[PDB]
Design a protein around this ligand. Structure first.
Ligand SMILES: CO[C@@H]1O[C@H](CO[C@H]2O[C@H](CO[C@H]3O[C@H](CO)[C@@H](O)[C@H](O)[C@@H]3O)[C@@H](O)[C@H](O)[C@@H]2O)[C@@H](O)[C@H](O[C@H]2O[C@H](CO)[C@@H](O)[C@H](O)[C@@H]2O[C@@H]2O[C@H](CO)[C@@H](O)[C@H](O)[C@H]2NC(C)=O)[C@@H]1O
Ligand SMILES: [Zn+2]
Length: 1016
């Protein structure tokens, strides 16, 4: 009974795209609630039989890196907050506290002595200290991939289950810069019942508050039935700090932040300090505070009110615990004893609030509206839209994607076996998962941390990449060596990884050359891994020390190969040009690897004395005035030269691409016969305002539409081969490359913004597609959501996250741009797509970072560009809020995010080598993925357990006849299965014991987790 995710438009009370269309966005002065109105209430609403029940929820926002590193904050702040929370909660049984960031809690609790560990477990068990969400971090929701949101959630909740014996079912997300429906998607499939959000556009807060729609059942945009719905509370005011959480008037609420009276170095900007509560003022102070509470309660439907009490790195000093607790206790004693207030107020936790709300709902006091959509792009005031962090620090945004994939591949490759503890597999994988998880923080992948904190994140992720490489190569050596020969040294490097696209050429000269020669080594084994659960072919390239190399498979069948030069681009400070130079001793060999589902395939590279029969050589043409020679050592084809001119290329049966004389795409012809469809790449620059608010790491505040980059007469390099052709051009700040391998082209930009201050570089595509004001962008790599460009909003409000792809279409034609990294983008006119490449900003943007963005470094951004005819596709109706990829665009996204992995055998001879692993793995239908495969038990467990997360996307149906494929039952991928269970996505709760030990496949747009148990 799968739900149809295409043809049924859900009926919801609030659909955010519709709301955006019909809503005004005027920024009017609301009074003391600057972005609201003067709230009025009827005092007679609450009375003896209907009291307002107020939960004051103490909290402390602890960033795992931002202006200090994780460890710096831990030593200077968080270890003291947690130590003093333990003490003060222990000593004050009615006090409560909620905690979100498990990275810090795990760091603290492991350093506690046993007596204090037991004390901590007691205040958790008795409900005083409550974990909210329980992720390793409170992640960004814009740039993060859903796989990594799940990874970090699982890392924190697995720790909490093991050590605290609790699993949160309420989420707390007070700080990400805008909010995504991927979160309720994952949380509802992970046992959650409630979630809270805060950072939404001030106009949205006003609109929803006017309708009492700040609490809603948030379902996915395609979900007609509502089974994805998760109850969500949106906070109504500008901040999560105490001045903006007691009620609408911050001048009043600041007087109830008792850390602000002076000795703590804090004050109230509204110039009225807090006063210590005493018997002689408690009636007056109570009157003021209850009036704020009753105004806040007017914005919600039940008689249960949430009052967060906290701020960043609060509840540190013992004196701060005392000043907040004793003054609130005095207020509660007075309020609760004076019947005319008709209030019962107490410290509470987040789960206590939600339980009481749903008790009111069950009592028939409220029904809640249904909502679908997202909450991007956030603006906290005026025109200050937070679309800059969709691009800031793009090197690390790209690195997140790379590490995402190597964590998946390392956990999958090593899951096939149990490993002795001496192999350190679990240690290395825990490290890798935790450093990637930490980077999902809303100051990590967002690019909003101080320079030295970004360096810490990068160093952590490099150690995680090294850890993944170690696990992967030990696993390949085990999976492909004859078992009676296998003799591992768990510290040795049997293989090294070769990655063509990270850090990427012009980024790092990291790539090892395979050194062959008659007097040293005639041949070398290489192995490709395919983490996807279907057979896959992909071209792979390696560097080799001779152009005379041929490829075989380990049945010694020849494999067709192409050798090309190794070209690198140089900014020549003497000629003031950007031009390529070729190596005269290293060459690139390219061939198609064919790899089993979730498997491995071995090939052999062999040198010979002359051109091998099954190896061809690319031609090379350098277009520039005033050329000079380009010798290439032993490469058998001389480079050709010419003046800049338009050129066209076609690889295989694929599209024909035409290029301008500046080396930029101008048109795509899909078929021999079909038209040249205009598709024009252009690079432009945005600047910064010379008056008013400045762009910085968070905010994008351009000084008008983008201006074209002046290109001069750039040098263009055309490489034409049977298997791979490309056009590369050295533009100012970007070496731009279009690569052809017979299908949709690959685009690579090596982006070096240099010392161009106050500049944002954008890549735009111009077409004739009649898209109007509509375009589609993805959310967290999970779903594509319809966007409408609104001219009532400024340019920066029409920018959205592009975490993995975007497209425009009309009745007949679609252009989809898939990315290998999250960046910001838009469609600012009909027929256009654009995506920001990097941004260098001299000023701070007044959101707390205290610096601009002047730490840029070269980054290789990767893309696929898919032009398609879509007039025969069955698409959603015009009212539906979602869009869906085609098969080719989905495969192109997978080619960027989860390419084949390439391993080079490190020693001269691999004794016992095998040619393949996984040839009998099922090759599953193209829309299904094994997103996670993770062994959950160490080797001493009698019953081994392996967890799998399956995800099925939804691809549009455009008339291509379906292949028979094989069903994938993950529970029988390993032998001796004894039990198969469906679980929450974190693997922490069993939901169903499955018949026959068979894990069913999932429906389109669904994600399920299974755990197989094996006797061992
Ligand atoms: C010191 O200058 C003030 O800085 C404020 C930002 O610092 C405060 O918040 C940070 C937030 O840290 C979290 O959020 C960041 C992203 O911002 C994130 O990266 C972190 O992970 C973390 O989660 C916090 O660390 C720090 O302790 C501090 O609390 C900023 O909000 C202030 O702007 C207000 O005040 C300005 C005058 O001082 C004023 O010009 C601004 O317009 C803005 O005024 C507010 O405007 C709204 C809407 O009109 C009103 O409703 C508010 O009442 C009003 N507030 C005030 C005080 O007037 C400021 O820049
Ligand atoms: Zn934060």
């Amino acid at each position: 009974q799968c739900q149809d995710v295409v043809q049924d438009v859900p009926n919801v009370d609030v659909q955010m795209l519709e709301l955006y269309d019909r809503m005004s966005f005027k920024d009017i002065d609301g009074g003391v609630w600057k972005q609201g109105w003067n709230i009025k209430y009827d005092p007679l609403k609450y009375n003896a039989h209907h009291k307002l029940k107020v939960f004051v929820v103490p909290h402390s926002h602890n960033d795992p890196g931002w202006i200090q590193t994780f460890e710096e904050y831990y030593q200077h702040d968080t270890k003291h907050i947690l130590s003093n929370a333990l003490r003060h909660l222990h000593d004050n049984p009615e006090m409560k506290f909620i905690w979100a960031e498990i990275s810090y809690f795990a760091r603290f609790y492991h350093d506690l002595g046993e007596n204090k560990k037991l004390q901590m477990k007691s205040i958790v068990k008795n409900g005083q200290l409550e974990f909210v969400t329980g992720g390793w971090v409170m992640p960004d929701e814009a740039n993060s991939h859903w796989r990594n949101v799940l990874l970090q959630l699982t890392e924190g909740q697995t720790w909490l289950k093991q050590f605290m014996n609790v699993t949160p079912t309420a989420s707390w997300a007070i700080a990400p810069f805008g909010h995504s429906p991927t979160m309720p998607y994952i949380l509802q499939k992970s046992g959650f019942k409630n979630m809270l959000i805060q950072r939404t556009h001030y106009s949205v807060k006003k609109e929803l508050a006017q309708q009492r729609q700040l609490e809603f059942l948030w379902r996915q945009i395609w979900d007609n039935k509502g089974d994805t719905a998760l109850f969500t509370h949106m906070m109504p005011f500008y901040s999560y700090d105490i001045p903006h959480t007691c009620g609408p008037d911050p001048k009043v609420c600041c007087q109830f932040d008792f850390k602000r009276m002076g000795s703590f170095g804090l004050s109230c900007p509204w110039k009225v300090p807090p006063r210590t509560i005493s018997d002689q003022n408690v009636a007056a102070r109570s009157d003021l505070l209850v009036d704020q509470w009753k105004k806040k309660a007017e914005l919600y439907r039940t008689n249960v009110l949430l009052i967060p009490l906290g701020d960043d790195f609060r509840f540190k000093q013992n004196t701060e615990w005392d000043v907040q607790r004793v003054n609130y206790e005095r207020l509660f004693e007075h309020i609760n004893s004076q019947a005319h207030f008709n209030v019962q107020a107490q410290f509470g936790t987040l789960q206590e609030y939600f339980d009481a709300v749903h008790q009111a709902e069950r009592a028939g006091q409220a029904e809640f509206p249904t909502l679908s959509g997202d909450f991007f792009t956030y603006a906290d005031r005026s025109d200050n839209y937070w679309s800059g962090y969709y691009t800031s620090r793009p090197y690390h945004k790209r690195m997140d994607r790379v590490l995402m994939h190597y964590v998946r591949a390392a956990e999958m490759l090593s899951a096939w076996h149990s490993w002795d503890g001496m192999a350190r597999i679990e240690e290395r994988l825990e490290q890798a998962r935790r450093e990637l998880s930490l980077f999902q923080h809303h100051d990590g992948i967002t690019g909003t941390a101080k320079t030295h904190v970004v360096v810490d994140y990068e160093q952590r992720m490099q150690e995680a990449l090294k850890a993944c490489q170690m696990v992967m190569q030990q696993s390949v050596y085990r999976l492909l060596t004859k078992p009676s020969i296998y003799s591992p040294d768990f510290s040795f490097s049997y293989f090294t990884l070769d990655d063509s696209r990270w850090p990427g050429s012009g980024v790092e000269d990291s790539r090892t050359t395979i050194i062959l020669g008659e007097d040293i080594l005639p041949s070398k084994h290489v192995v490709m891994h395919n983490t996807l659960p279907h057979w896959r072919e992909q071209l792979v390239d390696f560097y080799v020390s001779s152009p005379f190399v041929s490829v075989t498979d380990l049945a010694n069948n020849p494999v067709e190969a192409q050798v090309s030069p190794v070209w690198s681009w140089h900014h020549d400070t003497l000629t003031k040009t950007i031009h390529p130079q070729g190596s005269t001793t290293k060459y690139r060999i390219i061939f198609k690897a064919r790899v089993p589902p979730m498997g491995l395939a071995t090939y052999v590279l062999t040198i010979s004395d002359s051109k091998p029969e099954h190896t061809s050589y690319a031609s090379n043409l350098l277009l520039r005035k005033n050329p000079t020679s380009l010798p290439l050592g032993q490469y058998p084809e001389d480079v050709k030269f010419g003046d800049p001119r338009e050129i066209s290329l076609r690889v295989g049966n694929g599209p024909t691409l035409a290029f301008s004389e500046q080396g930029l795409l101008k048109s795509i012809q899909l078929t021999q016969d079909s038209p040249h469809v205009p598709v024009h790449f252009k690079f432009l620059k945005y600047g910064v305002r010379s008056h008013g608010d400045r762009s910085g790491a968070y905010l994008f505040l351009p000084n008008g539409p983008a201006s074209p980059v002046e290109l001069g007469q750039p040098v263009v390099l055309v490489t034409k081969g049977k298997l791979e052709s490309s056009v590369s051009v050295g533009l100012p700040s970007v070496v731009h490359q279009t690569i052809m391998r017979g299908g949709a082209p690959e685009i690579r930009n090596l982006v070096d913004i240099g010392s161009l201050d106050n500049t944002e570089i954008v890549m735009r595509l111009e077409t004739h597609i009649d898209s109007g004001d509509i375009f589609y962008t993805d959310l967290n790599g999970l779903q594509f959501i319809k966007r409408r460009r609104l001219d009532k909003l400024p340019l920066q409000a029409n920018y959205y996250p592009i975490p993995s792809g975007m497209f425009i279409e009309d009745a007949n034609t679609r252009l989809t741009l898939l990315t290998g990294q999250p960046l910001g983008g838009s469609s600012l006119a009909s027929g256009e797509l654009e995506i920001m490449q990097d941004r260098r900003l001299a000023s701070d943007d007044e959101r707390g970072l205290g610096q601009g963005v002047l730490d840029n470094k070269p980054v290789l951004h990767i893309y696929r560009l898919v032009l398609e005819k879509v007039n025969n596709c069955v698409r959603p109706s015009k009212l539906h809020p979602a869009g869906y990829l085609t098969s080719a665009a989905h495969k192109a996204s997978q080619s960027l995010l989860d390419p084949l992995d390439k391993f080079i055998f490190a020693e001269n001879e691999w004794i016992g080598a095998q040619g393949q692993f996984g040839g009998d793995h099922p090759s599953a239908r193209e829309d299904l993925d094994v997103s996670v495969m993770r062994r959950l038990t160490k080797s001493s467990a009698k019953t081994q357990r392996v967890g799998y997360v399956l995800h099925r996307t939804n691809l549009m149906q455009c008339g291509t006849p379906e292949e028979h494929t094989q069903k994938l039952d993950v529970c029988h991928l390993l032998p001796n299965v004894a039990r198969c269970e469906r679980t929450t996505l974190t693997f922490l709760q069993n939901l169903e014991h499955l018949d026959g030990m068979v894990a069913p496949e999932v429906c389109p747009m669904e994600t399920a987790a299974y755990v197989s148990s094996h006797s061992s």
